[PDB]
Amino acid sequence: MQLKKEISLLNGVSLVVGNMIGSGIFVSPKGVLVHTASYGMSLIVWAIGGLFSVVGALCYAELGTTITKSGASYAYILEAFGGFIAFIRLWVSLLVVEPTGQAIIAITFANYIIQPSFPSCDPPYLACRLLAAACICLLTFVNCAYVKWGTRVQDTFTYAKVVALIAIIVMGLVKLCQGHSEHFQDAFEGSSWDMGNLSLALYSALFSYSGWDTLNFVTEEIKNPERNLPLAIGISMPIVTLIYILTNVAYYTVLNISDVLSSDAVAVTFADQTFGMFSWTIPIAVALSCFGGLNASIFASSRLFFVGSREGHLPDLLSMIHIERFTPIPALLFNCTMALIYLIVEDVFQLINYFSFSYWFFVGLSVVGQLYLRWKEPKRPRPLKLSVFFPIVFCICSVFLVIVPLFTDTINSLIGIGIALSGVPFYFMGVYLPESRRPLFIRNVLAAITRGTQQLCFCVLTE
Amino acid sequence: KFTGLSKEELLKVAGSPGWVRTRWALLLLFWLGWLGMLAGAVVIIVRAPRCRELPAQKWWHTGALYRIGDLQAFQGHGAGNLAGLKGRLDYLSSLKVKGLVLGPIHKNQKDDVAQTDLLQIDPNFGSKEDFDSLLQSAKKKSIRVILDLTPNYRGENSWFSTQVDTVATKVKDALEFWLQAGVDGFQVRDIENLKDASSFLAEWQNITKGFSEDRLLIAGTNSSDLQQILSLLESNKDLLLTSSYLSDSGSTGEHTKSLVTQYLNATGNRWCSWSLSQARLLTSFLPAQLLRLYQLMLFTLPGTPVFSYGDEIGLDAAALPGQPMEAPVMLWDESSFPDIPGAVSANMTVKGQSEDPGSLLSLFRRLSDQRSKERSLLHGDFHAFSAGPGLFSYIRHWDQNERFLVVLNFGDVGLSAGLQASDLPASASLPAKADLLLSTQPGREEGSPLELERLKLEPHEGLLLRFPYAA
Numbered sequence A: 001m002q003l004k005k006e007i008s009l010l011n012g013v014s015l016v017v018g019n020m021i022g023s024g025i026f027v028s029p030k031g032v033l034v035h036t037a038s039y040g041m042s043l044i045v046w047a048i049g050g051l052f053s054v055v056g057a058l059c060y061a062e063l064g065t066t067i068t069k070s071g072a073s074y075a076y077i078l079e080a081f082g083g084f085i086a087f088i089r090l091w092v093s094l095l096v097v098e099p100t101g102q103a104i105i106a107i108t109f110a111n112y113i114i115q116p117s118f119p120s121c122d123p124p125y126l127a128c129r130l131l132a133a134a135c136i137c138l139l140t141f142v143n144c145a146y147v148k149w150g151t152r153v154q155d156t157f158t159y160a161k162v163v164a165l166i167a168i169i170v171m172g173l174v175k176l177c178q179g180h181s182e183h184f185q186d187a188f189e190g191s192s193w194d195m196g197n198l199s200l201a202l203y204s205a206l207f208s209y210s211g212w213d214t215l216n217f218v219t220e221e222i223k224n225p226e227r228n229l230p231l232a233i234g235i236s237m238p239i240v241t242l243i244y245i246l247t248n249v250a251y252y253t254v255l256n257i258s259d260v261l262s263s264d265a266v267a268v269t270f271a272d273q274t275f276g277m278f279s280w281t282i283p284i285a286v287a288l289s290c291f292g293g294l295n296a297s298i299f300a301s302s303r304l305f306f307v308g309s310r311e312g313h314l315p316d317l318l319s320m321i322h323i324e325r326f327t328p329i330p331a332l333l334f335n336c337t338m339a340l341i342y343l344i345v346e347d348v349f350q351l352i353n354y355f356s357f358s359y360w361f362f363v364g365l366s367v368v369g370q371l372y373l374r375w376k377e378p379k380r381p382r383p384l385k386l387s388v389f390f391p392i393v394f395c396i397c398s399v400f401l402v403i404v405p406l407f408t409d410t411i412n413s414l415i416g417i418g419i420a421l422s423g424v425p426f427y428f429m430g431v432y433l434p435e436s437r438r439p440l441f442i443r444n445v446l447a448a449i450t451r452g453t454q455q456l457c458f459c460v461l462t463e
Numbered sequence B: 001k002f003t004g005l006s007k008e009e010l011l012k013v014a015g016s017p018g019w020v021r022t023r024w025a026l027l028l029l030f031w032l033g034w035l036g037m038l039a040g041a042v043v044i045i046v047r048a049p050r051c052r053e054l055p056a057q058k059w060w061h062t063g064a065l066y067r068i069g070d071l072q073a074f075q076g077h078g079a080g081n082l083a084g085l086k087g088r089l090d091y092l093s094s095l096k097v098k099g100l101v102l103g104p105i106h107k108n109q110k111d112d113v114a115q116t117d118l119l120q121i122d123p124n125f126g127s128k129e130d131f132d133s134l135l136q137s138a139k140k141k142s143i144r145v146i147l148d149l150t151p152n153y154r155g156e157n158s159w160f161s162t163q164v165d166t167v168a169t170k171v172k173d174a175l176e177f178w179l180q181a182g183v184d185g186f187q188v189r190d191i192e193n194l195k196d197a198s199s200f201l202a203e204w205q206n207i208t209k210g211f212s213e214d215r216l217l218i219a220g221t222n223s224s225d226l227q228q229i230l231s232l233l234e235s236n237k238d239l240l241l242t243s244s245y246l247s248d249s250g251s252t253g254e255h256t257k258s259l260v261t262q263y264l265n266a267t268g269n270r271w272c273s274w275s276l277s278q279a280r281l282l283t284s285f286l287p288a289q290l291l292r293l294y295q296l297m298l299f300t301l302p303g304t305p306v307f308s309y310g311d312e313i314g315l316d317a318a319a320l321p322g323q324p325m326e327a328p329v330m331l332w333d334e335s336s337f338p339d340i341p342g343a344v345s346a347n348m349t350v351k352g353q354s355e356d357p358g359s360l361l362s363l364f365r366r367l368s369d370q371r372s373k374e375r376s377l378l379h380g381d382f383h384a385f386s387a388g389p390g391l392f393s394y395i396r397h398w399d400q401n402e403r404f405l406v407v408l409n410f411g412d413v414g415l416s417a418g419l420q421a422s423d424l425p426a427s428a429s430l431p432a433k434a435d436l437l438l439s440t441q442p443g444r445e446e447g448s449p450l451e452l453e454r455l456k457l458e459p460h461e462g463l464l465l466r467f468p469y470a471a
């Protein structure tokens, strides 16, 4: 009843890549450009953001191979900076960070699957919500059946999205070699060399690489983590940096700045421009990218809730496993149910502002916890130990990334801290308080429904 | 204390037929519900209205155009200088101009018909190389340059003669020359003074469309009767004709409405050009308290708004002395005009008006942006309904994008802005509440939702009430 260590290097490369490259490059690559007002300076800020995130990813390779526990920001914060702190992390990612991510990726998939039929106008609302709910249900089933099914889906759809991006890059660079070299003649001109603009360029190019640790959430299942984890992160960082910069070169080569800065889906405009026919290949490619991203998010979130309940911070129940299949069925059903609730809210696209301070606070806290463990107990067996250079530069960068969204837009980050902190009563009244002191009614009904769903789902907790 | 079910124990308790039947039933029910959700989605999609086609626009169908009388009087300098424009291209882009009309930069000496040749640029303005550099820099910022092909811009007539038309042959070969040079159109004026017009217009239109699809020809006349216009717009319909048709001092609210709607009904809502005159500025006919009225009108009618240089600041050639009214000077700064200092104020330049939110040039920039980005203004449909005594009001709605509505008063009196139409189409049903974008004179705030029944209207007020798509 152990959890099969079936995770492979390839499958790991696929998780990291196919979760980084989503719709952050297909439908909104105009974060750097608007605050930079030039071309060459935008490519340069892309490269710099890529370098800083590479350093961060090597820092997490070090952590993940030091501790070797799933959770990927919760096990480390726990072992290093406590369980209450760990419980704050689990509570925020239970309540608002994961369900909104999955709901929005499903909604965007739905938006972009039917777009060729509604090219200029807005596709309906009922149909978008129904296709999103159908997608989430299908993926939670595919992942509650086996685990090799989850990995085959991941491989297929990462291959698809990457071959589509290769199409875009090669067609752009075959345009750039047809003798035109047209927009690239007087680059760098008109740039905004203010500090108050390079700061926003860096911030918007550091939100574009978020997701570089989706392979740490499954560390307990990789074949032998000491070789497959750091190699997977080191092999999945430069691929994404190169594809980002080359796709940006393709965009800036074909279109000009007057519409790339005012286009609502830059890939679709590119397809309308160059591909005479086949203006429908790129929308379907964006739909496939979204489907793969959603699958990887379901993977990581199910494993995080699994660990959380295995620690006692959640019900004793989510730590079950299927007898004949070895898949955390109750955790996946719980995650699906939360996402299918959050689909019901109109205009969820706002909620991505209420946690843009929390998330990077937690990443930075995990890094400084690595520093604290490097100081306090320096005699643990560390298979690979890095110079303190990389945690230094990335903790600096995390100070930067938490300080930007507090000065501006303070009320949103403040209500975010309100949500994140809304979980301490449960802790202080039910969790930190020991066993056998709680009212007996709640324990009785809990165990009764536990046995109910257990017999219903064929799941006995880990051996 | 229950600790749920043991693995083996679980296997023992799972033998009851009830639980296995319940499991099978729940799986069956899940698949039924998922297929039903797909079917509902597809049904709802099929019961949804397909929506209209993009009319495949050219470049000039977007935004505004910008005329230029004399290049030296533009930068404020006595040296004609294409290189001098290098510091004005930006400014034009600041006004967000979708196009440009250079003055006649060819050589022009005197009434001689042969010595004036349209193939060489006057050295006082520049050369060929800096000219092509101007073209390339403009194309880098998307400012396509139309060349002024009126031959005699230093005489009483443009053709050196009312009768002879070998200058027309000069036009023909100049077309191919400058098109291999890289111009994006041509414009000729004083058409009422050229005989055998329609044939030349047809031939030039045909050859210009034969060179490309996006090459444009603009004719300009000082006519004022609808019959001459309709007679000139008989053969070819890509001809954009600028006339003095709209120049009305009284321009009562029901007068401008009548004029515009008759002009449109004569042509069945085709494409046209909206400007007061061929080469005069707006202020040459209007007072200072109506410039915002007209600059809000001409940026919303279904056409391409042709502007002469200096009308984005409200430049007036009657207050500034010591200059021919046809060729004023642009007041870049208070020292741009060296002669007679102190005569210029802060509200009469570009810098003193750039930061003023309630200035005139800010109105120009806001209007040009809203007209060069919104679909409902680009190619939307036009419908003007009757209103109060001296009011002009219409709507702009394309298919499903943000509708636009304007309220315009050609009166020095305050009126209650009652909007009673009862004829709007089903997809353009006027709601009772809509937002607001801006007004001519201050007094209200943007983003505030106003209810569309009890609107107060002060003298010379223009509004931009906006209501989104609905049933």
Ligand SMILES: CC(C)C[C@H](N)C(=O)O
Pocket: A019, A020, A021, A022, A023, A024, A025, A207, A208, A209, A210, A211, A293
């Ligand atoms: C968090 C991820 C799903 C987003 C993706 N990394 C992007 O660049 O858009």
